[PDB]
Design a protein around this ligand. Structure first.
Ligand SMILES: NCc1ccc(-c2cnc3[nH]cc(-c4cccc(NC(=O)Nc5ccccc5Oc5ccccc5)c4)c3c2)cc1
Length: 293
């Protein structure tokens, strides 16, 4: 809960799911910082009752999340209108857009090579650590994908959720049968039964890794949405991208076990990668913290 005068919207970052996301300046929201650049989530004038409820619900649920590898909620301006949901600025935006920019051909190439093996390991652990935290909170993401991971100024990757209705990744969703669903990221049991669990999140994590190593190509490229449903439910999974490191490939195969109970947990992933991460990882991670029991 934050005073309205402590927040100033500066510019549009882009359309969120039910409203515009702004970049703003926040006064005295973090201890030791007189100012902080922030992202500010708002709700459209054309948003429905159901959507406002989801918007506010998200803010409320995120009040209980504190993790270095999950996009943080800093505060809410809720007194009067409009509701401003203030969050940490992730300067480099979503991982899909970022990965696609790293393509040699890409017109918005930021002037740096594709991700190295060590950068891939670091990303993987950070994503897995954020998910491990969320799982400890009995949260199931339901839409884990590179497009929902976010990249900070220092290139730390964190779990986010833009929702499903951004125009830029429309084709990442299919209106199966009902509601929009990220079918190319979904576990076979989720496609069949409609159930989402931490284990189906793990499946999606496998797909995120595939995205990282393929610079965010479309999963099951040569298959239509209907074909993907049938392919995955019958035991199909993705092929390995070209020049994919063996270590990352091995993780993918763990994530894509048909039986969800054969898949690893997010804590197990971090445990596999822990030794090769940045020295700061133990000082910030959920995995190494007292909270992890
Ligand atoms: N393409 C230009 C651009 C670049 C950056 C951003 C940007 C930058 N920094 C940001 N910080 C936070 C956001 C943002 C924007 C919209 C929605 C959200 N929401 C979440 O990420 N929430 C979330 C995080 C982790 C797990 C789940 C989450 O959602 C739910 C939580 C509880 C219940 C239901 C959902 C963040 C942003 C955009 C936007 C556009």
């Amino acid at each position: 809960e934050v005073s309205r005068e402590k927040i100033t919207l500066l510019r549009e970052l882009g359309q969120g799911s039910f409203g515009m996301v702004y970049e703003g300046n926040a006064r005295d929201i973090i201890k030791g910082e007189a100012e902080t650049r922030v992202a500010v989530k708002t709700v459209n004038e054309s948003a429905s009752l159901r959507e406002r409820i989801e918007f506010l619900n998200e803010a409320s649920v995120m009040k209980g999340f504190t993790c270095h590898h999950v996009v943080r909620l800093l505060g809410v301006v809720s007194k009067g209108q409009p509701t401003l949901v203030v969050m940490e600025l992730m300067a480099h935006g979503d991982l899909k857009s970022y990965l696609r920019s790293l393509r040699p051909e890409a017109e918005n190439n930021p002037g740096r090579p594709p991700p190295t093996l060590q950068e891939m390991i670091q990303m993987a652990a950070e994503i897995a650590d954020g998910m491990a935290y969320l799982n400890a909170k009995k949260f199931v993401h339901r839409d884990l994908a590179a497009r929902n991971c976010m990249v900070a100024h220092d290139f730390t990757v964190k779990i986010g959720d833009f929702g499903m209705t951004r125009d830029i990744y429309e084709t990442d969703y299919y209106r199966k049968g009902k509601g929009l669903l990220p079918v190319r990221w979904m576990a076979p049991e989720s496609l069949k039964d409609g159930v989402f669990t931490t284990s189906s999140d793990m499946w999606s994590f496998g797909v995120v890794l595939w995205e990282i190593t393929s610079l965010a190509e479309q999963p099951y490229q040569g298959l239509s949405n209907e074909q993907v449903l049938k392919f995955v439910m019958d035991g199909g999974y993705l092929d390995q991208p070209d020049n994919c490191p063996e270590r990352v490939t091995d993780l993918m195969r763990m994530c894509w076990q048909f039986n969800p109970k054969m898949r690893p947990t997010f804590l197990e992933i971090v445990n596999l990668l822990k030794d090769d991460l940045h020295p700061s990882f133990p000082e910030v991670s959920f995995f190494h913290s007292e909270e992890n029991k």
